[PDB]
DNA sequence: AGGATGTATATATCTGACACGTGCCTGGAGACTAGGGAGTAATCCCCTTGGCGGTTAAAACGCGGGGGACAGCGCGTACGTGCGTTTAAGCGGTGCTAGAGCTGTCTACGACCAATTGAGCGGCCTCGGCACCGGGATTCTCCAGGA
DNA sequence: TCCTGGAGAATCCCGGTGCCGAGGCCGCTCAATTGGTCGTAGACAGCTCTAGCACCGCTTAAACGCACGTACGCGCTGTCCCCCGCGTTTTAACCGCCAAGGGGATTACTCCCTAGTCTCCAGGCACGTGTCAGATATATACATCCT
């Protein structure tokens, strides 16, 4: 139940950075599910890369490669 | 006593958090979540700190973009509050 | 003319496998050839990226397998990996 | 020889309207 | 011809960008020292003396192709039209567009008027038609009730019209992509759809105008020749023939380019023929005293400086001068209104 | 010498192992290509081809036809979740769209 | 006479065209538009027939998908008529 | 450069054609301005694709735009097209 | 032998023409790499770096700071129409977002 | 070990454009990733062009067309100008 | 217009991260050779374009009307704001060791080459699966009139 | 007020006929296979030094929960205008056909340029170190939101 660690205020702040002024009470569980799906995809790709390298550690480069795979190139961590 | 009307602090926080760049989700809970998700794909896995930082940066960027789209959908519906159907429409149009 | 190459004969053989009493039009054959070329390019590019990322100069079956896992959805990936493993095992046997 | 003189929308003395 | 450059104005920029030059300007006309010019999405009214642009009208996406003034009894109205086949009559002095006529469903090549009994407007569009309109008198509220008087069918796309000098309201000449023809525009005949009465023989005719009451100046592309032929003698030689060789008076040597849509003009009071060329020059012919005869003068493209550099290469399409030949305008494909005194 | 078996015969495949090996070696994917790489890639392509063809032939049968036209391939792809995900940014010529009318647009 | 209620023939056309695969834009007008657009990038350009046809297939696919997204947005807005704002919203969320 | 090109071939994408495209997409009612919006969007799309295709054609030192040019352009734009020699 | 002249100096570039040539060669892009491809690529990369840095430093000045930080690169990229299209599917770490509030939310 | 980066060259360009400006570590890493990403894009497009045209060599022509395909309008124009200028200077010397 | 809350700014502190220097060494540059690539010229036939003429489907224009967009209003509730209490996250410091990174060996697999052959491709041709179509069956829509 | 019957338009289904492209066969040629050699990529072992995990204590900022009021979601109602549907007229797409040449595609040749190699050295990276640009803390002036 670590998805609940993404608190209501955390999602509220994320929405605020997105320009959202008023937030419905059902937005929180929807956002938790969305974040979970995104993390599942990215982490699956990263762990596939980590397994290919015969490594038991997930490196920042594995995440970068997964993100680039999904068309979400990330700068500031190498590559 | 003094009491700002609804929406004032909302705009203030919008401005405040668009001015900053610091990660908005707490680091420890997100690390726990990342490890929990990862363990379903391979047990006994170790994460570089930079890896969790990259995951958090990407996740926050994704959520902020999705909230921009959700807010646009809400405005389209002649509404100022964002609701789950807004996120669903945004994601359906995005190809997700 | 100059010999052009396509996967027409192989797609036809596979079709007669799955559905013996059925045919295919030229446009459908072109679509299938395009599909095979596209999946080839995707998997080969992923294998090349894996070799480069791991500082290896060989595209081996391990690279192709990880590329298949990365590119294809879950169940398709599982069946594709099973088929490839079976093919390589049978090839090595002979 | 005169150079080419640019006349932008703000340089017109009057705009014709519909 | 003691002509000197007076202005080089860039006032038809697209997106209001000073960097727009390639856009081509197509037609200009003097109000009955004020000239209206058209090209791109704008119609401009320019004072040739001072160089100030008096008025500008913009319609989105339109590529204006023709403008013409008419003195109405007491407004000097300005007609403009172009790509969209809509004739827009603008009251320039008042500062607004009065009415719009949806004349053609295809692009309108060019417009013309004449000293007809009143308010006539021939419109030549790419649908292979020339329609004669009677725009009527404007009511108290600046509204026009346009009527269709007659439809001319053409074997090709019409490019320029010139009402016959000695009978402007009886017969009309028009230059088309298939050659030149004459159409009977007399109102007493009852039939409303009329084919070409006579097709003249000298290929497209991209320039056409009367030098005097009897002599016609015409040109095509890829011939390096400007033909002068008599209207009176040709019409006397017609009989009943639908195809009639013209009575040629002289030929004038012109640039040999095969490029089309290079139009000519005249200044009858001075016996002048004007036509720009692909090098930006203005070829001038004084045919009063008048083998291919030579131009009396070639006014070379003075290469004015643009953005600090010379505009070395361009093309001039239309050249028009006032009756007294005190001001000559040459329009370029470079968004430059060349003005000469 | 000995008769040639063909690498596809050894792998029990129908797609060309030799041609796939040549394509890997000439596609500039790596300085070296292993012996097992073409076999695996050919097997994967053959399986994907079998899946699409199975679905498309089912579509043709449902459409009372004996030949696969692009419509049948489009139906097969878009009615299968995983193939649709795989061919997400792909447009098939002469394929059309799946029948779908939103509930609200139907008569009340 | 028969005066099918408004919307019935609309649903009928939806069914008719979602059943079929034939291209919906007339061939010669689209060919001319393709040549006109290509003119601004090069002159005296020739087009293989297959090239024009590929452009038309891709263009119709794109427009159909855009109209699906537009319709979803319109229904989100509690509406049945698609309007320019719907296309604008769909294109913005798509990232175009 | 051609001198007097009539940039009016977008109107050839007719109102009924846009309605048919809408119906294939499941649209029931269409507003009047949808047609001009669609024309602009189609112009932008075709401009991007044809620019890429002509760029390939220039690179090949060819003067005719082959179907593979369009396929490569669409692949660039992430719009993979099957059925023309993929 | 003769005094060594760097290929970058010959091309008047600061980016490494030799390193770019090696990367092109050791990257499986083609069997052969021309002598001009590295120069063109180094020039283009140097131009893009200069273009991004100019706007990033302008953004840094506009905030009264001497050092460029990820926020500054974010501002530079997202305030230029052309760069934002080039990096339209790129997320810059610690860049934040451009300040933007929709009109109807304002009072 | 030696971990090659474009840090020194980015610093040189920065001192050419803003002589009085510094750059942070994270900014430098972002710039390094940007350089590497654009390198990969241009190189991949050039490789695709060479493969399409049945050529085994990546000339400056392929790089020029890759820049045209990838970068938007004004950026593409300026990049092509810079590249052709660099090639002209290299050939002359 | 004032009270209050927040924001902006103004300064001092201090500090750790940037940027500069020095030493080393590995990748780059100079010089050279050799062969395959690619430019260039010639030739040829395919495919693009261009025109014409008739036929008919589609577009276009207009007219009437209904139903859907859109504004105005009223109500009820659900979300923003604030305050107080509780939780746990962040920081720091310490300790441990798993495993990521590097090095050396050795060897097995893959590139390369030469000879042989049959798999696949172009071409050619025949017939039957599908396009088309004219008639009947069905199912679907819409309105008038009775219960 | 609602339903049911009836007509009416539309679509689906079915049997007949035809046509051109799928599907099979033939001949050839060049791409894959086989057999062999050689070199180095990488697989595996051994060693080491980071850094990732765990743990513990203290502080305090953030989260949580509850109250409360009001701004808004939304349901309803009415109006009117604009999109649909359908008839009639206008237009030009499209099919078939013929004709011409522009240029793509292929072939033969030949000089150029680039891969590969040996040699030499300086450009760039690692490491070390000093100091000043920016984060932090505390205090005072300016903005503005609600009463």
JSON list of C-alpha atoms (C1' of nucleotides) in Angstrom, two decimals, chain K residues 91-95, chain L residues 53-57:
[
{"chain": "K", "resi": 91, "resn": "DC", "atom": "C1'", "xyz": [19.33, 15.04, 8.00]},
{"chain": "K", "resi": 92, "resn": "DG", "atom": "C1'", "xyz": [23.40, 13.46, 10.09]},
{"chain": "K", "resi": 93, "resn": "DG", "atom": "C1'", "xyz": [26.38, 9.81, 11.40]},
{"chain": "K", "resi": 94, "resn": "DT", "atom": "C1'", "xyz": [28.04, 5.01, 11.47]},
{"chain": "K", "resi": 95, "resn": "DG", "atom": "C1'", "xyz": [28.84, 0.40, 9.67]},
{"chain": "L", "resi": 53, "resn": "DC", "atom": "C1'", "xyz": [21.32, -0.83, 2.19]},
{"chain": "L", "resi": 54, "resn": "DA", "atom": "C1'", "xyz": [20.37, -0.83, 6.88]},
{"chain": "L", "resi": 55, "resn": "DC", "atom": "C1'", "xyz": [19.87, 1.38, 11.37]},
{"chain": "L", "resi": 56, "resn": "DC", "atom": "C1'", "xyz": [19.30, 4.96, 14.93]},
{"chain": "L", "resi": 57, "resn": "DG", "atom": "C1'", "xyz": [18.20, 9.59, 17.02]}
]
